């Protein structure tokens, strides 16, 4: 590789995307990791690890999904604002802009949820709480199965040790996916994505010397993101088919509305 006009342009694109990402997304990976590693003086979340601690911290499934979707409107808007900053995006056919975002937002929301997760649990209530993974897994069916696949993904994705400057480019690559169904004009999308992929490959070489094949490993994570999104349909089918009791403590319903 050489430092030439093309590589300098790819670094400028990376910086433009990082600056727009910081402007668009108040909750960054750096802020979430500072909380989760105890490297902050200011925020100490309450830990919810069992029914007792749940109380000390003071249709059901469909209500959860309606609630978390409503709570995720702000994220959808932030991702849309970010997309407008990707060079070329707003010049695409408007039908295609909507198609790219309507598929991409779910994958992006799961990518960013991983920043809030470690092997032990997930930040909730705007960083003020931490809900454990094994407590979520212990809840009665179908609830106890909702989040575990996301934790399995997050552990593997977080093992790549990406930072916010890496994530800004990766999220742009997700948005500019020429494979989405119903796209009218695939070539101009792939033209932008090719530029974004070049910028991502250079970013990961410069930022991760000790990683082998990080670019390929990161692109392969898109398979896991897609699987989780695709499985949401099956989860709705499981709910309708569940004949057992699906009551759930009101505070747990509120916690799940903060997830996805």
């Amino acid at each position: 590789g050489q430092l030439n006009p093309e590589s300098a342009d790819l670094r400028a694109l990376a910086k433009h995307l990082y600056d727009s990402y910081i402007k668009s997304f108040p909750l960054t990976k750096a802020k979430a990791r500072a909380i989760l590693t105890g490297k902050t003086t200011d925020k100490s979340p309450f830990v919810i690890y069992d029914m007792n601690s749940l109380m000390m911290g003071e249709e059901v499934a469909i209500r959860i999904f309606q609630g978390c979707q409503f709570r995720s409107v702000e994220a959808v808007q932030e991702i849309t604002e970010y997309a407008k900053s990707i060079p070329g995006f707003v010049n695409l056919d408007l039908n295609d802009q909507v198609t790219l975002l309507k598929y991409g937002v779910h994958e992006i929301i799961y990518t960013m949820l991983a920043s809030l997760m470690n092997k032990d649990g997930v930040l909730i209530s705007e960083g003020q709480g931490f809900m454990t993974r094994e407590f979520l897994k212990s809840l009665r069916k179908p609830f106890g199965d909702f989040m575990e696949p996301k934790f399995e993904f997050a552990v593997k994705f977080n093992a790549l040790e990406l930072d916010d400057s890496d994530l800004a480019i990766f999220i742009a690559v997700i948005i500019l996916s020429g494979d989405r169904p119903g796209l009218l004009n695939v070539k101009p999308i792939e033209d932008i994505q090719d530029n974004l992929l070049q910028a991502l490959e250079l970013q990961l070489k410069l930022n991760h010397p000790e990683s082998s094949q990080l670019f390929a490993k990161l692109l392969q994570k898109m398979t896991d993101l897609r699987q989780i999104v695709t499985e949401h349909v099956q989860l709705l089918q499981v709910i309708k088919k569940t004949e057992t009791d699906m009551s759930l403590h009101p505070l747990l319903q509120e916690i799940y509305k903060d997830l996805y």
Binding site: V73, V76, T80, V98, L101, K102, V105
Partner: peptide, 13 residues
């Protein structure tokens, strides 16, 4: 998910 499409379309305006 027409609700989601409407959110995105409005946010693009």
């Amino acid at each position: 998910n027409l609700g989601l499409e409407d959110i995105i379309r409005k946010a693009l305006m």
